[PDB]
Amino acid sequence: ENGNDFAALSARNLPNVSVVTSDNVSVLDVVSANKVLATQTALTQIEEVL
Amino acid sequence: PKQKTHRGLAKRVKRTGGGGLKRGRAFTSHRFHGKTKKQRRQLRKASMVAKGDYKRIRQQLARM
Amino acid sequence: MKLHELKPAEGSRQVRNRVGRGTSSGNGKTAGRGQKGQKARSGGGVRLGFEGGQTPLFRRLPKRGFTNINRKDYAVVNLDTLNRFEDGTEVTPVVLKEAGIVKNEKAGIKVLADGELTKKLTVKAAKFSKSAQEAIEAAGGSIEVI
RNA sequence: GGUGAAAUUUUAGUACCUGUGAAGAUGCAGGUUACCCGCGACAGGACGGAAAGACCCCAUGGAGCUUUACUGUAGUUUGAU
RNA sequence: AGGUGUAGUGGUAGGAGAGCGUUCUAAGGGCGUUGAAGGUCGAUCGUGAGGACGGCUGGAGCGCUUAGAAGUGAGAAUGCC
RNA sequence: GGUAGCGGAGAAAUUCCAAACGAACUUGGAGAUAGCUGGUUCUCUCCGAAAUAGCUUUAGGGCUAGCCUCGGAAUUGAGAA
RNA sequence: GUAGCGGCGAGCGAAACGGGAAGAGCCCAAACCAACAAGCUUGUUGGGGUUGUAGGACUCCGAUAUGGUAGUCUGUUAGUAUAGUUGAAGGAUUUGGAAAAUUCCGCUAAAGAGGGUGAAAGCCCCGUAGACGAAAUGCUGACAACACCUAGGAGGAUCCUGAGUACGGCGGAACACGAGAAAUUCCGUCGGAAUCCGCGGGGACCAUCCCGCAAGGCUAAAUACUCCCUAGUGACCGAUAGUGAACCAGUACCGUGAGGGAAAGGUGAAAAGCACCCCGGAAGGGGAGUGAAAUAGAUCCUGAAACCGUGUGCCUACAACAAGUCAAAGCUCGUUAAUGAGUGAUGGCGUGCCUUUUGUAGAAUGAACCGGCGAGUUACGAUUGCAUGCGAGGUUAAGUCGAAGAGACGGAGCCGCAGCGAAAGCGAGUCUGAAUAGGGCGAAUGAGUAUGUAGUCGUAGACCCGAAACCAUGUGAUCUA
Ligand SMILES: [K+]
Ligand SMILES: [K+]
Ligand SMILES: [K+]
Ligand SMILES: [K+]
Ligand SMILES: [K+]
Ligand SMILES: [K+]
Ligand SMILES: [K+]
Ligand SMILES: [K+]
Ligand SMILES: [K+]
Ligand SMILES: [K+]
Ligand SMILES: [K+]
Ligand SMILES: [K+]
Ligand SMILES: [K+]
Ligand SMILES: [K+]
Ligand SMILES: [K+]
Ligand SMILES: [K+]
Ligand SMILES: [K+]
Ligand SMILES: [K+]
Ligand SMILES: [K+]
Ligand SMILES: [K+]
Ligand SMILES: [K+]
Ligand SMILES: [K+]
Ligand SMILES: [K+]
Ligand SMILES: [K+]
Ligand SMILES: [K+]
Ligand SMILES: [K+]
Ligand SMILES: [K+]
Ligand SMILES: [K+]
Ligand SMILES: [K+]
Ligand SMILES: [Mg+2]
Ligand SMILES: [Mg+2]
Ligand SMILES: [Mg+2]
Ligand SMILES: [Mg+2]
Ligand SMILES: [Mg+2]
Ligand SMILES: [Mg+2]
Ligand SMILES: [Mg+2]
Ligand SMILES: [Mg+2]
Ligand SMILES: [Mg+2]
Ligand SMILES: [Mg+2]
Ligand SMILES: [Mg+2]
Ligand SMILES: [Mg+2]
Ligand SMILES: [Mg+2]
Ligand SMILES: [Mg+2]
Ligand SMILES: [Mg+2]
Ligand SMILES: [Mg+2]
Ligand SMILES: [Mg+2]
Ligand SMILES: [Mg+2]
Ligand SMILES: [Mg+2]
Ligand SMILES: [Mg+2]
Ligand SMILES: [Mg+2]
Ligand SMILES: [Mg+2]
Ligand SMILES: [Mg+2]
Ligand SMILES: [Mg+2]
Ligand SMILES: [Mg+2]
Ligand SMILES: [Mg+2]
Ligand SMILES: [Mg+2]
Ligand SMILES: [Mg+2]
Ligand SMILES: [Mg+2]
Ligand SMILES: [Mg+2]
Ligand SMILES: [Mg+2]
Ligand SMILES: [Mg+2]
Ligand SMILES: [Mg+2]
Ligand SMILES: [Mg+2]
Ligand SMILES: [Mg+2]
Ligand SMILES: [Mg+2]
Ligand SMILES: [Mg+2]
Ligand SMILES: [Mg+2]
Ligand SMILES: [Mg+2]
Ligand SMILES: [Mg+2]
Ligand SMILES: [Mg+2]
Ligand SMILES: [Mg+2]
Ligand SMILES: [Mg+2]
16 A cells, blocks of 8 residues: 555565555556565555556 | 648549549530530539549548 | 466467568569569659559549538437437437537537437437427427527 | 789589580580690680670660750840839 | 368469567576587488587587567678678 | 869860869768669468550550459359360 | 648648647836926936726826835855765585585575676675765755835826838738738838727728737747766667777878778686797797696687698599489498498489579679678558457547556547538438439448557658769869960
């Protein structure tokens, strides 16, 4: 979700992790990942975007 | 750039509902003494652009 | 899908044909142009509609008519399109625009009697064909010129 | 003995006659002649080399020239202002 | 998935179809000082473009699969160096 | 020292103007234009012409038709012998 | 690519409306007033005034406020550019000349961007994320100061509101508009107004109506471009490429001059660049050394081909041969082990490749050979096939936010859903016609649209190379007249 600075900061350096915000999520983002880890509020925001 | 319509053609033909082209007739300007009344009467009627000619000019009227 | 297993839909994408890349391709050497002449030349070819000097078809034919400066063209609506509204609906150029039936009303809405009208409506439009007026009122509706 | 280019050159183990063939073949056919490698000489052939024929024709090519060709125009001259 | 039967399968201009190989991109999966690419040799495989596998050379990078994009294939231009 | 290319100079030859002057040289417009000649690079499979008519400041160019190819629609089967 | 322009040819080609980016408005001249100077006006200065629902002067009253700024090396302040500081975490083992490779267990991460290091390193180095830093000089923003602008309402008697101007004739030009029926704008020439009861425009012209108020000036932003500077990016090049120039290149070299204009990168991890010896005058070699390797020795990585040579398995001195191919003894060899390899006496058959042609071995063309380079591309449009999404609908463009991304918003617009007619116009019809006729085009008898992809076309050099020439600036009379 938007505003979660510290979760984004702590995740991004891991070589197997890709970080996006719920409002900036692209098809290429999703297809690249084997798994999607989404917070509950991120999922709700996505469902509001789509 | 956009393709340009051939302006001279556009002044002479009309796109019909079937996509064909309606055209006027040659030999309808003067020297009517040289032509029978039957010829004049039937040249009074409009015609269509023939198949061979249409393929040659079709690109020139795409956006007419 | 997976980035290592992409597949386009069948027939969606084709391979470009490259000319002048050997004889067995079928477009080697002359690259499909044949032998000599104007059409074999780079940039060669005559302008569209050129008949090699025979008077072109368009020169043979007279210019006809004129364009009216005051010409008015109306957006056509037929009765079958008005069956989409419920009985008693007020059909308006605004209503038709919101319905997406008429995006461009041009000089105005004109109603034509192509199909059969089956609902009662109070129809407002710039013009009415006589048949369309009868159909709308025969359905117990009413027309109004705006 | 020393020094050391060049034009040319599809690859060439590169004969003769008569014939044949895009109608004048070292190279195809038939026959004839001819051991292998050179050196000094000569030019008949390789339609030899050199130059994308200059003659000829063609290209709705070019350039220079001419005139009572066309269309313009510097200059000159005449009038109005 | 294959099988049977009949028929067909010369080809310039040219149309159609289906592929080979080159460099790069992405993802996946891999190979490399226990020797990558490149070079060279071999009696190897496929219907073709072409593909492997060994020895030698070489000393750092490079395949494969799927998809993408192309300065993507040369023997001729009196081509250029 | 003077005369410069829409030019100069010429005891006059189209003569000279930096080793080609019916109009210098250089750079630019500029990749001028070239209905002309030359060149145009991997593979296999299917099919496969034309060198004709008409018109053309047209005749070695072009255009429509004819002949090739690919796709599609459809009929009381309209083709061929 | 519409309206139009156009030997109505080739071609040329708008504008307004609509949607956006950005937005900001102001000063003069004249009337009039005051001062001064001069010859009642006639100049200078200052005031005054600035326009179209007409404004202003002027005459009445009434407030000396309130707001604004496209002012200044006016300071003050903050930020910022131009140096920097700080910045986590690995040791062994196997291979090797060397480890970052490998295996084993660890750890660090707001840092796993990237570069370097004796091979390929998150933890060795430079860095990176992050935190931090300015004596000095710029630049920017505020804040303050100062300066500069900023009056309301009612009256029309009179005065002002840009003249040799507007405009017209003639000749040119600009307007998409080629004189045309040619409005609008401008240039030369000549003629030449009105002025508020006025003047201009609404595409000849007139009337009416509507909209404006020329002949004075200034004005930020949204727009164009990048020689340079800083930080970066690339399904861009990788030395015949990429700039002409990776290298002491606009150099060498050519030319009187303008001007033309090259070639040319790589030892190795480190020079550790071969002490010493030997042949030689030297060059150059042979040893000995260095090195993991010197057949890495500086013409130095790799080291193809043409070409040149040495060795020799087989063949060749009676033979006329595009030189191979098929058949084949003999001899010599032993493989990706395959009904193998090399050579080949002798026999049959057999006139290269390309281009261009009715027809070429051609005594037509092209190639000395080898290597490299060298030709249908891209953009915008048209159109068709294929494909996907949606479907009587389909779709956004510019733009805004956003990683130079996807995406979101944006419906202005575009195509389609109705045609017929030159047009008024009518409309599943319509036009022609007197016609309820006939006939044309349509409907009946519906599929479109966005995007991708391919074929072809159009505008562009448009597949590549090639003229003789044409035009416009320059450079040359050191040759020669
Ligand atoms: K016509
Ligand atoms: K006539
Ligand atoms: K073709
Ligand atoms: K011949
Ligand atoms: K001779
Ligand atoms: K000449
Ligand atoms: K090998
Ligand atoms: K060549
Ligand atoms: K002389
Ligand atoms: K066809
Ligand atoms: K357009
Ligand atoms: K013409
Ligand atoms: K004032
Ligand atoms: K590193
Ligand atoms: K400062
Ligand atoms: K005019
Ligand atoms: K107007
Ligand atoms: K107006
Ligand atoms: K080496
Ligand atoms: K030998
Ligand atoms: K033989
Ligand atoms: K010849
Ligand atoms: K009818
Ligand atoms: K009728
Ligand atoms: K579709
Ligand atoms: K398409
Ligand atoms: K081109
Ligand atoms: K093209
Ligand atoms: K002289
Ligand atoms: Mg007439
Ligand atoms: Mg007659
Ligand atoms: Mg493609
Ligand atoms: Mg062919
Ligand atoms: Mg060829
Ligand atoms: Mg050719
Ligand atoms: Mg021919
Ligand atoms: Mg042809
Ligand atoms: Mg004969
Ligand atoms: Mg003979
Ligand atoms: Mg022979
Ligand atoms: Mg024979
Ligand atoms: Mg000769
Ligand atoms: Mg010749
Ligand atoms: Mg056969
Ligand atoms: Mg490579
Ligand atoms: Mg190429
Ligand atoms: Mg070559
Ligand atoms: Mg003479
Ligand atoms: Mg001379
Ligand atoms: Mg030009
Ligand atoms: Mg056949
Ligand atoms: Mg003619
Ligand atoms: Mg550190
Ligand atoms: Mg490790
Ligand atoms: Mg004009
Ligand atoms: Mg006027
Ligand atoms: Mg005038
Ligand atoms: Mg008004
Ligand atoms: Mg500006
Ligand atoms: Mg270079
Ligand atoms: Mg190289
Ligand atoms: Mg160069
Ligand atoms: Mg070696
Ligand atoms: Mg070497
Ligand atoms: Mg004998
Ligand atoms: Mg013998
Ligand atoms: Mg001949
Ligand atoms: Mg030959
Ligand atoms: Mg010969
Ligand atoms: Mg030759
Ligand atoms: Mg001079
Ligand atoms: Mg002199």
